[PDB]
Amino acid sequence: IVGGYTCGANTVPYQVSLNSGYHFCGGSLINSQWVVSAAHCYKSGIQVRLGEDNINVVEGNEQFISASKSIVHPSYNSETYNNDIMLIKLKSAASLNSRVASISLPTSCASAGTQCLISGWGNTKSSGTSYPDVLKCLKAPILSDSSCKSASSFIITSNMFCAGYLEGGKDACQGDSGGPVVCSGKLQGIVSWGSGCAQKNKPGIYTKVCNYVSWIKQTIASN
């Protein structure tokens, strides 16, 4: 997260770190057994880490749980990042508490102008490299598709939205991938893709979770 702020320990209790020997992606806890992340975060040997603040220190509120199944969206396109979403089932149910909590799925999509909370342990610099140990947060509004398209020249599918600031300086970044965009207590976005980080006229692009609720629900029902 570039141009954000320190969240505060366990202030984003649905925020997950995916670990494969090191933190490599975020995720969102959607019930005691399932995590939503980005399809581009798929890899073998994922351990889900709940209750994290400092990812390099055991602070006492963590739960580390292996993935038992990973389900990449059937239509994930690794060139365009269309359908950039994945479900991860936990080997064991997380113990839910004030610091490890699920986040609700949308009942309907959010609109341009709505303010959202974006979080993760990704790069904090728009130029160069700095990875935080503690969770970072950013408030950012959803942009209209038309303003985003004209500003960036990006192709934005129906399953994507732009959020952030066209002026640059505030954005998600590498390492935030797969993490939450929460708006009015609903998981509306997943950190997906972009062009650099916090650059002018290059806002963050996010998987539009509202389009996947039926898929998530039926997948969970049958797995």
Ligand SMILES: N=C(N)NCCC[C@@H](NS(=O)(=O)Cc1ccccc1)C(=O)NCC(=O)NCc1ccc(C(=N)N)cc1
């Ligand atoms: N030609 C097409 N259509 N390409 C789609 C993929 C574009 C790709 N862009 S990219 O390489 O600039 C992403 C990046 C890599 C290193 C450092 C900063 C940013 C990209 O974003 N790749 C996946 C990725 O790196 N995702 C992580 C990510 C998370 C947040 C942002 C952000 N600025 N909000 C950007 C990338």
Ligand SMILES: [Ca+2]
């Ligand atoms: Ca920790």
Ligand SMILES: [Cl-]
């Ligand atoms: Cl529009």
